[PDB]
């Protein structure tokens, strides 16, 4: 199957935000994030009202192109074996959450898809949003992995049972020079 990618603000008015940037830059025109391998990618979570205690935030990657959407996105044969473990993320997972000991990594028993989920934290004092720092652990160009195929990251706001409360998404290109590729794609 293929996880839904339909934007859904839900009852809490959930949506993502990105900084204005290089190692990580977001293009609103392309709804696409360009980043270097294993570098911090700040993603903001915005809500109109605070969701219930127990709400969680999950991130999962899927291939963007129809002919590849059914294939599970995972790290390539080289990166899954480089022992760059952080102590929590399984080595096959493309997406990691940085600096959160409550992050949980899932390998779905029915879809076999990977995801990382953390508890939703309401904004701190003096802040209007919550920021999650993600890392992408394989290049878009990795052979035997994404192999130049574009991916989408789907972020979902879920209740304590895992039911859907909100959804947003963005394309991602993990590359050596985000700045250059961003300009090229904006141009085209």
Q: Residue 90 and residue 20: Cα distance in Å, rounded?
A: 31
User: Was 138 annotated as part of a binding site?
Assistant: yes
Helix or strand or coil: residue 24?
A: strand
Q: In what order do the strands lie in the sheet with 151-158?
A: 24-27, 32-35, 164-174, 151-158, 56-63, 114-119, 104-107
Q: Among residues 43 and 138, whose Cβ is nearest to Zn ion?
A: 138
| Dihedral sign (CA 48, 95, 74, 138) | positive
Q: Is 151 in the site for Zn ion (CB under 5 A)?
A: no
Q: Is 51 in the site for Zn ion (CB under 5 A)?
A: no
Q: Is 33 in the site for Zn ion (CB under 5 A)?
A: no
User: Was 82 annotated as part of a binding site?
Assistant: no
Q: Is 138 in the site for Zn ion (CB under 5 A)?
A: yes
User: Was 41 annotated as part of a binding site?
Assistant: no
Q: Is 93 in the site for Zn ion (CB under 5 A)?
A: no
Least separation in angstroms between residue 126's CB and Zn ion is 39
Least separation in angstroms between residue 52's CB and Zn ion is 38
Least separation in angstroms between residue 146's CB and Zn ion is 8
Tokens representing residue 55 in the block:
């709400």
Length of the chain: 188
Q: Is 173 in the site for Zn ion (CB under 5 A)?
A: no
CB atoms closer than 10 angstroms to residue 11: 12
Q: Is 76 in the site for Zn ion (CB under 5 A)?
A: yes
Stretch of 68-76, 82-90, 105-113, 153-161 lying at the interface with Zn ion (CB under 5 A): 68-76
Torsion of CA 25, 29, 31, 35, to 10 degrees: -20
Which positions lie near Zn ion, rule CB under 5 A? Answer: 76, 79, 138, 142, 145
């Amino acid at each position: 199957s293929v996880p839904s990618q339909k934007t859904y603000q839900g009852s809490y008015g959930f949506r993502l935000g990105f900084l204005h940037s290089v190692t990580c830059t977001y293009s609103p025109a392309l709804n696409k994030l360009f980043c270097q391998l294993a570098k911090t990618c700040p993603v903001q979570l915005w809500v109109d009202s605070t969701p219930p205690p127990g709400t969680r935030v999950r991130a999962m990657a899927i291939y963007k192109q129809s002919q590849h959407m059914t294939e599970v996105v995972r790290r390539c044969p080289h990166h899954e074996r480089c022992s760059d473990s952080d102590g929590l993320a399984p080595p096959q997972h493309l997406i990691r959450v940085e600096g959160n000991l409550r992050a949980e990594y899932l390998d779905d028993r029915n879809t076999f898809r990977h995801s990382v989920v953390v508890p939703y934290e309401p904004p701190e004092v003096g802040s209007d949003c919550t920021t999650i720092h993600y890392n992408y652990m394989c290049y878009s160009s990795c052979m035997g992995g994404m192999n130049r195929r574009p991916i989408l990251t789907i972020i979902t706001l879920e209740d304590s049972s895992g039911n859907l409360l909100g959804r947003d998404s963005f394309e991602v290109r993990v590359c050596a020079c985000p700045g250059r590729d961003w300009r090229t794609e904006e141009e085209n």
